[PDB]
Amino acid sequence: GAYNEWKKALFKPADVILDPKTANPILLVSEDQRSVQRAKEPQDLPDNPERFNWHYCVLGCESFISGRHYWEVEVGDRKEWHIGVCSKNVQRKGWVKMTPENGFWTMGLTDGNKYRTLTEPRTNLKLPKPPKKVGVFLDYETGDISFYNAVDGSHIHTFLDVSFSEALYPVFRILTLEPTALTICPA
Numbered sequence: 264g265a266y267n268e269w270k271k272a273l274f275k276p277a278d279v280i281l282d283p284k285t286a287n288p289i290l291l292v293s294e295d296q297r298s299v300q301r302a303k304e305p306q307d308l309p310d311n312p313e314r315f316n317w318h319y320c321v322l323g324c325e326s327f328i329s330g331r332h333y334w335e336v337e338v339g340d341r342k343e344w345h346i347g348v349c350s351k352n353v354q355r356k357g358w359v360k361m362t363p364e365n366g367f368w369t370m371g372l373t374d375g376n377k378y379r380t381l382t383e384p385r386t387n388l389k390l391p392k393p394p395k396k397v398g399v400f401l402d403y404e405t406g407d408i409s410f411y412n413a414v415d416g417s418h419i420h421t422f423l424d425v426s427f428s429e430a431l432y433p434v435f436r437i438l439t440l441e442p443t444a445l446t447i448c449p450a
């Protein structure tokens with residue numbers, strides 16, 4: 264459909280690979296750096312400045328300061344996941360609420376069937392069909408971050424008219440221990 268035929272004409276396909284130096288020590292990044300899982304217990308890793316030490320987050324390796332970009336994430340049958348973008352300068356040490364005011368523009372799924380945007384306060388989304396693959400779209404200049412069901416092209420949510428000033432990274436968060444990983448589709 265139009266989603267597949269037009270996406271690359273409007274947005275540059277980003278080749279997103281996960282940065283293991285950023286990942287909370289309870290997360291495992293796959294060898295190909297496209298997939299993340301959770302461990303039962305935190306692994307023994309350095310508390311280097313780029314690493315999230317409280318939130319169960321990991322970033323892409325590259326950030327964006329201009330332009331239109333997109334990437335796609337296979338969420339599959341996971342019961343919990345959150346994805347989107349965040350500012351380079353978010354607080355990675357200690358707790359902050361993941362909200363736009365704190366530099367995070369994310370949405371996702373909790374408790375198997377509760378879709379939300381991570382706003383303040385959180386907003387519930389009503390999705391006709393549960394997505395298995397989600398497209399994340401950034402237009403830096405217009406300030407729009409938009410999420411689509413990447414199989415049927417349906418709209419999930421858009422953060423409108425944000426005034427970005429910092430570089431933006433893809434961000435991924437998983438809280439639960441489940442058999443299915445969260446995985447980036449290669450460009």
Ligand SMILES: C=CC/C(=C\COP(=O)(O)OP(=O)(O)O)CO
Nearest residue numbers: 317318319320360361385436438
């Ligand atoms: C270690 C805390 C669990 C965690 C996130 C939960 O944060 P939260 O209670 O503010 O909930 P929410 O961000 O609304 O899902 C790791 O990213």
